[PDB]
């Protein structure tokens, strides 16, 4: 069937249901941010308050599909990274944690011609 999905909002002596969407059969990532944002397939559907925590109770995959190998939960922090996107999909990543990588991700280049490039002191 089509699945109609709701936030059950619980408060000190109440429950309310806010309707979200007819959830498409084609979701592949959910990312929930500490600052309240929930992004589904890379798009930010929801904004919410600061979160203390999340509980999950995910139910195992539908065993008529391939259902071999792993699905992954990543605990993560925000960082500036240079990303190359093709067809909306990440091809490559570079992390601006060091002064050679901060040069690359200031010139928006994964690799550079020899030269003198302006950099700030650390």
């Amino acid at each position: 069937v089509p699945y109609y999905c709701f936030l059950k909002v619980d408060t000190y002596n109440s429950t309310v249901y806010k309707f979200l969407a007819v959830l498409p059969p084609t979701v592949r990532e959910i990312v929930i941010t500490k600052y309240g944002d929930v992004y589904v397939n890379g798009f930010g559907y929801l904004h919410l308050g600061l979160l203390d925590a999340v509980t999950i109770n995910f139910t195992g995959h539908g065993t008529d599909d391939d259902v071999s190998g792993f699905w992954t939960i990543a605990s993560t922090n925000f960082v500036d990274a240079l990303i190359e996107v093709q067809g909306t999909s990440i091809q490559r990543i570079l992390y601006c944690d060091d002064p050679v990588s901060q040069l690359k991700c200031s010139q928006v280049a994964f690799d550079l011609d020899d030269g003198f490039y302006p950099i700030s002191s650390r």
Binding site: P24, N41, G42, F43, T88
Partner: protein, 243 residues
Amino acid sequence: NLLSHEQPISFVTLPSFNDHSFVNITVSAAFGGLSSANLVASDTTINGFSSFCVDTRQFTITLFYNVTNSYGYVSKSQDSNCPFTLQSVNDYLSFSKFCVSTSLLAGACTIDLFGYPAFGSGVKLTSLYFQFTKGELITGTPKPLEGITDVSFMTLDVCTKYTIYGFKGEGIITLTNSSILAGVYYTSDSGQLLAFKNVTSGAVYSVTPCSFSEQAAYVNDDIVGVISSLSNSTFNNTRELPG
């Protein structure tokens, strides 16, 4: 394009059933004085309360006026410190949250409603304070608009007055088989909509403006031919060239 402003309206939004609540706003006042017309006993309510916040994915705002002028009629106007007017909120505007109050709210815009009981300086009947956030889930609407899996409607291949995920314009919407795996809409560097998904299906649709630019060959005070992207035009012959 010859369409004489008979053009269809289109509305594409994240998949919904008809999930509708009205924000009925009642404004009330009484008037008196025989030397000049002046205002007493004003009150305002939103669904019968003093403040309201929308939880349903569609709403309509309505004004009811319940004005009792002895001089026979009242004319009415609005001042808006706001990116909408009440009658415009209904014309498919999309929000993340939307709350309305007869008293100030943290970020609020004001719509002030005025009555002119004897022509000259009017009087404030009420002030409505709107707190809202630009977003995707809650849409203003004219009337509860029917559907079971989706609320959306499109006319394809014809110039349409579209609202698509909060982008407004005139354009031709065409199904393209260039499926794209992330996001919901794709925009130019110019911040204009180029394509969007019907996210309950995966199908992607492309938006093109319904009048394209051309160059007119003008010679001896007539247009003798036109250079175009289009396969058809008012001239009786057409020729295809590489570009």
